[PDB]
Amino acid sequence: MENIAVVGIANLFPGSQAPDQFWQQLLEQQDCRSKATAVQMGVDPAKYTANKGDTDKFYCVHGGYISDFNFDASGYQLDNDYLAGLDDLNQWGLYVTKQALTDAGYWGSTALENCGVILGNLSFPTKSSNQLFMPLYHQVVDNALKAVLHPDFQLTHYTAPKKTHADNALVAGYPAALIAQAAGLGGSHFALDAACASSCYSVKLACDYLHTGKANMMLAGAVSAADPMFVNMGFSIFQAYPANNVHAPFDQNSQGLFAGEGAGMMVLKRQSDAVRDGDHIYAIIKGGALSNDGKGEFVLSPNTKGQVLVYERAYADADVDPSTVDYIECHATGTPKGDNVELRSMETFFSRVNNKPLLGSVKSNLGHLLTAAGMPGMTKAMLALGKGLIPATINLKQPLQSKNGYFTGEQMPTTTVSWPKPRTAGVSVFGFGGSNAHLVLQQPTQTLETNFSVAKPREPLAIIGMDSHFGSASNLAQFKTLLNNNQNTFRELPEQRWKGMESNANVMQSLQLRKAPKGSYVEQLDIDFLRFKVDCLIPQQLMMMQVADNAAKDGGLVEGRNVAVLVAMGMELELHQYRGRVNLTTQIEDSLLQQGINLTVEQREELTNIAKDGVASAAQLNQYTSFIGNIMASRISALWDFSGPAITVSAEENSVYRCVELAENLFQTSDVEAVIIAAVDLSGSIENITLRQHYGPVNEKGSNILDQQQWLVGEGAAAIVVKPSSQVTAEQVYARIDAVSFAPGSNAKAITIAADKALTLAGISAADVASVEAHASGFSAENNAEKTALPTLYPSASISSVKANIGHTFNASGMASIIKTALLLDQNTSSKHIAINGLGRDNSCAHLILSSSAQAHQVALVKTIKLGGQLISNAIVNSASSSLHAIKAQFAGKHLNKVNQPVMMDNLKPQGISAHATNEYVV
């Protein structure tokens, strides 16, 4: 398809804040890696440093960090004081957005009305999101230790407490919507996670949106700003840090990687428009491709078969002879297994044309920037293509060679070299979970192609396979029966679902809750450990895997095929429990010191271990891989040996509807045969109830739907299989998705604009709609906007919402609505059309039209895992530790000093955050 021009670039990398500064550092072979400090960890790092294999410790503090960056919050379309109170994650993304648009010459342009943004991002806790959840666990730990040790015992806060805006918990998807609002973008926006490949996934999909005309300009970039303690504990349990402290991509002596943080952004336009408008072109994206490794390797290990495949797909897409590639910016992280596999893959592919391109890795200078890792790689390659110079890979003294000696150090510049027919470069990124991307780049040019291929025309999507697990409605058949009988799944909180925290009077007082709300909780799931290869994986991933597997079977899918897996989700907020455990190391030490009780080292470790085990289990290898959101999509692709892209997609409540839009685009721009769209939100956690209370009151009793003033608790997971309508048979089809459309904003006007677009796309009139599936969230501003817009649009249609049956499932809520609607249309025995409306914290309105089809769809070691976990207080107060008796006697009758910083509960109080429709922070 058409050449894409890069017309603006920005970076915030370890060591640099602008592309020319970064380039000069590369030319000078600057090492930008450094040791983490309390600025990164919020604690003294030495207290958490030990040897490999030591529990709750990391064995390496080296990384690529962002030091001495002072964000300027002025000059955006959102108020300075609001933006100043957001995490590095948000601020770094806003910074590179402003810089990249200003570089391209479009900051504040009316052209931004047709500009979208796709953002690679980690679904991990951030330094700010921790502040919103830690006091839940630590108040309970504090009160248990008072009961065990001394009524005046006081636990210290995990770090210096800071007042923290609730929006800092919207980690995965909201940063992309915030960029769109703060820069005035009017096009599509979402975040995605493809682990180390997310930057090139974002660029490739943004090119796709340009090729289908969904936008006339796109921002594509990524940000890596997770809590460094969470990141480094993970790479320590993975044993990914080098035992000899040598991180040296391509070097024989390298034993591992160092991780890193930062952000990057690029501005993309079709080359025809860039030449017409007189933009500065940095480079041409000639083509590229995505792939998944499919079956064969552990979720953290690369598979050469998927890497060769993405090369084949990329040069075919670019229509470029692989003989012409001069330089490849490699994924090479310094991990031995991965460095050798990538060298084998490149040997296999390029030896077919007898080409030996130069090779390099900017991970040598910066570390591995995780979701942002592709940004410095692509920036290096595009600047090298424009300037005709290739910077060195640093610290490379004794280079590896490929399996058969095809590539050696002769192809790896260790100084700046001149460039070795357009100058042509490849960029490769190979992420955890088998997620691969390769982009083909060429030097900038004003010359337009005379002939290029075009995207396929869009078609309605046919839903051919579905499964659902909402509350106690544990499969599609049970959900269908529930809906037809107008029943609900509302129940009291399962005993272990909040780890017993609903019994803590101080926590519940802070949350202003008389009781845990009645709601559609999932108490447990049954799963076949044999089929799914299950140190257990967290329920977020197990729930998604089960429904996706069932939907794939229901849709008649076939193993080994080019099928994509998109998972709509936001972060598992229960991931904060892991640092909730780990941080008690210094919290308990500080408490004992400050209060004046001098235990032995062995007594203090035993006391600390008892408290830790109450909160969470110590990190284990497989369990930590399930903390990584994109891996749940990869696990399905590995089970089915699928080769399409496998990613998570995050856009808050509109996550699923952005997946529908993406699936349509994937069929237009690639040869993918089917797309699984799965969705999961275990939104009955205490963390989610805490978070959503900041936006409006919950219905504690769990019991015109638009007239409700409180939201209902629910949780679960569901999945659908979609194919283009022209490629399914009648007996497969539940219902068709005829249109999905979006409009910026959250008010009644935005609803009518999105609805008009969707009705036009579907080819029907508003009077053709039989009924309306309202969002009906129970947040008053959203309900009130729908009460205005929907009866006006559809005066003769009845309005209802699936949330009345199974509650508000937040990041999965679009899937509940689609599946309810598809089941109803599949039952039609009256051409019938139903509209679905969507609102959320992403500040856009989604509107969908679904339609009935000719026929009803034709149907084709089990272990129980409970959600939640061990009761925190009981695990501490009833501990069977023998040495606990002697510790209690060291406390008996003593006067304790007050601690300097006790656990603070202020951030738990419902914050009263105004809805997007109020425009409270719009300048």
Name the DSSP letter for residue 473. Answer: B
Least distance in angstroms from the C-beta of 279 to Mg ion = 18
Give the residue with the Cβ less far from Mg ion, 287 or 714: 287
Token couple for 411: 């192809």
Q: Least distance from C-beta 318 to Mg ion, angstroms?
A: 6
- Coil/strand/helix, residue 840: coil
Q: What is the Cα–Cα distance from 589 to 585, expressed in whole angstroms?
A: 6
Helix (H) / strand (E) element for 802: namely none
Q: How far is the CB of 215 from Mg ion (least distance, A)?
A: 17
Our CB check for Mg ion shows the closer of 5 and 785 to be 5
Nearest distance from C-beta of residue 1 to Mg ion, angstroms: 5
CB 10 to Mg ion: min, Å: 24
Answer yes or no whether residue 426 interacts with Mg ion by CB under 5 A.
no
Q: Considering only residues 829-868, where is the footprint of Mg ion by CB under 5 A?
A: none
> How far apart, in whole angstroms, are the C-alpha atoms of residue 866 and residue 536?
11
Q: Which is nearer to Mg ion, 30 or 445 (CB)?
A: 445
CB of 3 to Mg ion, least distance (A): 6
Query: Which is nearest to 180 in space by CA: 268, 90, 89?
Result: 90
CB of 4 vs Mg ion, minimal distance in Å: 7
Backbone angles phi, psi at 299, to 5 degrees: -65, -20
Tokens 């084998």 belong to 344
CA-CA distance, 589 to 598, in Å (whole number)? 10
Q: How many residues bind Mg ion (CB under 5 A)?
A: 1
Nearer Cβ to Mg ion (8/287): 287
Closest-CB residue for Mg ion?
287
Alpha-carbon distances, residue 533 vs 372, 625, 861 (angstroms): 30, 13, 10
Of 287 and 614, the one with the shorter C-beta distance to Mg ion is 287
CA distance linking residue 616 with residue 580, whole number of Å:
8
**DSSP string covering 565-602, please?**
EEEE----GGGHHHHHHHTHHHHHHHHHHHHT----HH
154, 158, 162, 168 alpha-carbon torsion, rounded to 10°: -130
Shortest approach of Mg ion to residue 448 CB, angstroms?
12
Binding residue ranges for Mg(2+):
1, 286
CB of 7 to Mg ion, least distance (A): 16
The binding site comprises: 1, 286
Nearer to Mg ion, 216 or 408 (CB): 216
Cβ atoms 14, 367 nearer than 8 A? yes
d(CA 93, CA 405): 42
Closest CA to 339 of 266, 419, 254: 254
Binding to Mg ion in span 259-318, by CB under 5 A: 287
Measured from the CB atom, the residue of 287 and 338 that comes closer to Mg ion is 287
Q: Which two tokens stand for residue 548?
A: 């996706």
Q: How far is the CB of 413 from Mg ion (least distance, A)?
A: 27
Q: Which residues pair with 836 in a beta bridge?
A: 773, 848
Q: Which is nearer to Mg ion, 316 or 923 (CB)?
A: 316
DSSP symbols for 637-667:
HHHHT--S-EEEEEBTBTHHHHHHHHHHHHH
- Based on CB atoms, which residue is closest to Mg ion, 164 or 669? 669
**Would you say 286 or 916 has its CB closer to Mg ion?**
286
DSSP 147: H
In angstroms, give the least distance from the CB of 771 to Mg ion. 44
Q: How far is the CB of 429 from Mg ion (least distance, A)?
A: 19
Q: Are the C-beta atoms of 328 and 426 separated by less than 8 Å? A: yes
Of the two residues 454 and 922, which places its CB atom closer to Mg ion in the complex? 454
> Measured from the CB atom, is 324 or 788 closer to Mg ion?
324
The smaller minimum CB distance to Mg ion, of residues 381 and 781, is found at 381
Reference 13, options 430, 511, 376; nearest CA is 376
Smallest separation (angstroms) from Mg ion to the CB of 425: 15
Which residues have a Cβ under 8 Å from the Cβ of 53 and sit 6 or more positions away? none
What burial letters (b/e) apply to 174-205, b meaning 16+ CB within 10 Å? bbbbbbbbbbbbbbbbbbbbbbbbbbbbbbbb
Closest distance of CB 563 from Mg ion, Å: 24
**Alpha carbon distance 346, 678 (integer Å):** 33
Q: Which residue has the tokens 């570390």?
A: 367
Q: Among residues 827, 840, 712, 846, which one has the least CA distance to residue 773?
A: 846
Nearer to Mg ion, 313 or 658 (CB): 313
Q: How far apart are CA 488 and CA 787, in angstroms?
A: 23
The C-alpha angle 684, 688, 691, rounded to 5 degrees, equals 150
Tell me the three state secondary structure of residue 458.
coil
**According to DSSP H, which parts of 694-747 are helical?**
none
**CB 250 within 8 Å of CB 399:** yes
Strands (E) in 36-100, as ranges, are 62-64
- 88-104 vs 174-183: helix axis angle to the nearest 10? 40
Closer Cβ to Mg ion, 287 or 433, answer by number: 287
Closest approach of Cβ 125 to Mg ion, in Å?
39
Residues that bind Mg ion (CB under 5 A): 287
